[PDB]
């Protein structure tokens, strides 16, 4: 709205003109402050969360590095994230480079302009204060000191000549501080713009060249996936086409048939049969047989621990049990102990009892 | 080809119901549950990079709004709205770009890595029910069978039926879940490469839009960063000028004396202005001081420089001034008019003598 006219002629003159004119400096300078420090809290709020940011990127790479851990070593995929991987972690220490220049450019233009920057104006605008009141006081004294008996207007003109000029080097400093606080102002503003976009330059280019040196292992990664992807494809169609065959053709619902196998020491041989507890309630149950140097043992599950039904074979007898309910019965007799088995056909009875007719055998 | 979740699977094992194959069996469980958990791991610190993230590009895009605010201040300067309108355009750009970046890793993310543990998982969550319905009713099958009583030659027929399909259904799926978890081998492999080059490829449309926008801008920078050293020279030049003078004025100049009234400027002839102090016209008693002019052949104040003029002499023509050596205040002197009188007092002899010759030659001028 206003034009400022802080020369020092209107300096010199003390014109109202010139008192506005410093007004409108003040209410400039006092938002130039809060549009500063506001700035260097959105600063906060920037770097604050650009380091959480950045934080989280680098947990997200090594989840990254966890995910592809499992299984086994795999040439093509550790070749992947060795170069990929290193590749995201350069871009995130880039990106905290771009934060610290960011960072040193709030300090050294914006925050040492509210501080350091502004102290001469704000030490020249007390002074001039200061003089302005001193010389409204010697100006009206000087005025109203009768003429009827006096020295002591003498002594008022003495005064309000110094405070004239004492104000006058007070309207002149404070004014020079003024022209240089406006050319700081936008020289600091402009420098710190400037700083911001030269160091989305150096970030953007460190990451763009690294990723450019990248670019022929990514296409050949593709291609690569992708004709993979096609011959993993094919396999499985191979694979279902075999499955398809196998289940019309060449398995069938024939029950597994251990073989007696020479093992070392001695006659081998494991399969599944029912057995009869030896508590009250005589539970048949269905568990894993293992014929082994000369004991017969079982398990329920891979590496449980053997129980031993028969401590020694070759001091036992093997009969049927024509006097049992349920089918394909046999009995295993030792000296005090006797243990009851089942077979689940006809053919896996005769199987097992010759089998352990053998291993009777020393 | 190689095996590694396929590495212990034998057919020889499966055909035998062997408790060895059911443990193979729940080793490829255990290891597929583990890549659940990772993966599951994995979407989650997802998430955590993208509400991050999200949350980065907002406070930035403040900052540079602040950016704007701080710079709309003071008198406006062209310079400085070309700078702050390349640059903040740019640096918006570069959150664009970042927004669209994230966007692209939340893509793939939910692509190959969301899809893989849902739905990628399915076919095998589907096999391994049908492989344990099958291993259960080959189990009730087997009991049943061994339950059958003796002379129950019929029941023996139909008992020994269902056991034989219950053996060669319980194959048939041991085959399908097989080829489930060949599948899912190759899916965690192909679907994480996948994964982390589409990461890379969104990194790279990033970066070398960034890097695109900011060469573009490339001659404007280091011309800029020409203009802002010397714009800094010449403000050193200037503010030594500056000090030269006022060391001149405090120097080669005033005793301390009042500025005399000035004469300037052509609005209706020539003008003159200064302070005065005035007593208030009604035996008020109100010595005021206030900034007078010689305008337009009036004599006129103000207070501050907004104010709205008072007149005090509508016409030169129609005034007398007066000394007033006789006075209760020192240098003293009248103003009459027609309408209008006014006691007015300077603040030296000087400016006494300076003001009163300035009004006759007013009102002598102002008959021309």
Partial sequence: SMTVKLDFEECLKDSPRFRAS???????????????????????????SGRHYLAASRAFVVGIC?????????????????????????????????????????????????KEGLRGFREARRDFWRGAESLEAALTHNAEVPRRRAQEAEEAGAAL??????????????ALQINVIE???????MEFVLRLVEAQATHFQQGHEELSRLSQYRK??????????????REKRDMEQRHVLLKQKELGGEEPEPSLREGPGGLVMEGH??????????TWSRRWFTIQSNQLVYQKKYKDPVTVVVDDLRLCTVKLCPDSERRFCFEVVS????????????????????????????
Wanted: a negative charge; glycine letters at 4%.
């Fill in 22 to 48: 410093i007004e409108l400096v003040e209410a400039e300078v006092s938002e130039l402050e809060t549009r500063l420090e506001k700035l260097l809290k959105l600063g906060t709020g920037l770097l604050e």
């Fill in 66 to 114: 966890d995910l592809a851990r499992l299984g086994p070593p795999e040439p093509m995929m550790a070749e992947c994230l060795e170069k990929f991987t290193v590749s995201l972690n350069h871009k995130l220490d880039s990106h905290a480079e771009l934060l610290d220049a960011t960072q040193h450019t709030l300090q050294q233009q914006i925050q040492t302009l509210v």
């Fill in 161 to 174: 000549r110094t405070a004239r000029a004492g104000y006058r080097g007070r309207a002149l400093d404070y």
């Fill in 183 to 189: 050319d700081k102002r936008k020289f600091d503003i």
């Fill in 220 to 233: 050949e990664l593709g291609a690569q996936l992708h004709q993979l992807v096609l011959n993993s494809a």
């Fill in 273 to 282: 049969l029912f057995k009869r507890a030896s508590n009250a309630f005589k």
């Fill in 335 to 362: 000296t005090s102990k006797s243990c009851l088995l089942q077979a689940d056909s006809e053919r896996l009875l005769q199987l097992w009892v010759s089998a352990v007719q053998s291993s009777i055998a020393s």
